[PDB]
Nucleic acid binder design. Sequence first.
DNA 1: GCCGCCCTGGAGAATCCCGGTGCCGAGGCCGCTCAATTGGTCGTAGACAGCTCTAGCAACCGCTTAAACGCACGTACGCGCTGTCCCCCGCGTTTTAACCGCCAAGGGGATTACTTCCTAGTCTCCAGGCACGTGTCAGATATATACATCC
Length: 49
Amino acid sequence: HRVLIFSQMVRMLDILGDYLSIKGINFQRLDGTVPSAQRRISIDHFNSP
DNA sequence: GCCGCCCTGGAGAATCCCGGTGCCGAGGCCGCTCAATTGGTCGTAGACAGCTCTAGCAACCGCTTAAACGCACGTACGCGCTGTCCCCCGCGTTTTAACCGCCAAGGGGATTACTTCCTAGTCTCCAGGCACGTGTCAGATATATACATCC
């Protein structure tokens, strides 16, 4: 299964991103700072078979 | 034999040190004396509590778009060097007025004490000016419709 993790603060999302970076898990991120082109890129990267 | 010249010793006067006594600056003491202290009373300034409504704040979003930023070029200006000349500085000499010490009388102004009265504080009562909200009204603006006209 694949998992989404929703959060209210993007700094907590940065904390989980660093946790997965040292942990070494292929992760993707989405927040308000990401522009819509990279949003489309990340959604197509996540939804690919 | 008589007179003139060189060498050396003790007593008179100048100076340093110490003690007694008189004068300047400052502190202890005394006397007045007025303002700080103490004690009591009372009114009210402010602390506290309570309710209502509005602004701020942390952290996030999304969109727009104009400002910020980076880079390349070019050229204008800051800066350094050199010349030049002129004007300010240093010094010697002469003048002159600031400074200090003097009249000569008179008014201005600071105090001390006293008298008086006008005016501003305080209190009570009242009313109208200021703040807020609203109905209404005339000027400004936009369009509806009818008449003259060019192609």
